[PDB]
Design a protein around this ligand. Structure first.
Ligand SMILES: O=c1[nH]c(=O)c2nn[nH]c2[nH]1
Ligand SMILES: O=c1[nH]c(=O)c2nn[nH]c2[nH]1
Lengths: 112, 112, 112, 112
């Protein structure tokens, strides 16, 4: 009964990044899920839980380019799809990986 | 005559991350280069320059897992290969993308 | 009925920083509060709320040095007291300012 | 013959933060220096060197509020003066402490 959640903050305006598409995939495979953050910059249902959450490597494709585009970065943005690889060791643990995001930089961390 | 350089700092000990392997690839392709940072956590020759640097999307595969492993994170580390996608718009510009790295989090930015 | 909360994550081990002392003070004054984070790296009661929360500048003194010391950085640590100044404009708003912390670097942000 | 340098990057536009005032002071004292970053977001002469650099705690007052103000955050900005405390142990070592800055968050690290 593990769990994988996330969270996006736009450091340009201190608000949660809303309606950003997030791709989810197992390492070496194709997208398996596609979600859009709510107003809190989170997703209602965990990105992964129970059976689903299998120990291994995953990748999340945060669509930063489109998000900043709507809030305005340019025709060929520096950040298009912020990609995040990570390995989930224990299948019964909680993994909260937020994303602090800016047009030209970002923080990826295992928060609480 | 554009240029792509990078830099790795281990925020766990304030020192540059040395001898870390860095994979380089164009979006959707296979590795095209493989380098190992020196003692300053940089690479002698630009990761990309002149002809090579074509406008588009690239990906750098920082091998964080192995680096921390040598400095010690575990059998199934949270971070294995920190992956970084980005788009290089102008082919004649300088792009310096450093990496602030920690066992459980990291910063990716367009520095100077 | 505004609110000021915070949160500390130790990026060295992906866990919340527990029992870290946090000083709170208005700009130019002496400490007014002193708290110790719980196991979630948070404090049970808001650091500021209602009447208390007056528009202006505050400072939080995160005692990183002692925290890392207990988990081990040295005799004269790089980070001793991570100091964070910020201005609270609206008195009725919620301000969540977490702290991503490492022996040699840290992130300060207005999260959700 | 130690050295203290710094560097400011505006993560909102990937450029160095130019002409930002930086206050320098020893712990518990008044400003001792006041500098303004050049176009590279650095200062020509080290903020501290040789004799000057004495082992102990210092504080740098990055004037983020004014900088973003000129580039535009509001009347009562979240960040006014980003304050950074740190301890310099060895007097003969090089300490490079850059600042990744955004209207609502920032990274402080011991870079190379
Ligand atoms: O949902 C979250 N809550 C928090 O308090 C937090 N702190 N960092 N990341 C976080 N994510
Ligand atoms: O090579 C670099 N030099 C610097 O001064 C710097 N600051 N941030 N990233 C950087 N990379």
């Amino acid at each position: 009964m593990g769990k994988l959640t996330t969270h996006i903050l736009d450091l340009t305006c201190g608000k949660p990044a809303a309606n950003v598409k997030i791709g989810l995939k197992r390492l070496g495979e194709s997208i398996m899920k596609e979600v859009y953050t709510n107003n809190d910059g989170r997703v209602d249902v965990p990105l992964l839980a129970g059976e689903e959450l299998m120990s291994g490597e995953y990748v999340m494709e945060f669509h930063a380019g489109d998000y900043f585009a709507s809030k305005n970065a340019a025709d060929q943005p520096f950040l298009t799809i912020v990609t995040v690889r990570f390995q989930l060791a224990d299948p019964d643990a909680h993994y909260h990986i937020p994303l602090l995001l800016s047009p030209f930089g970002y923080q990826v961390y295992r928060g609480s």
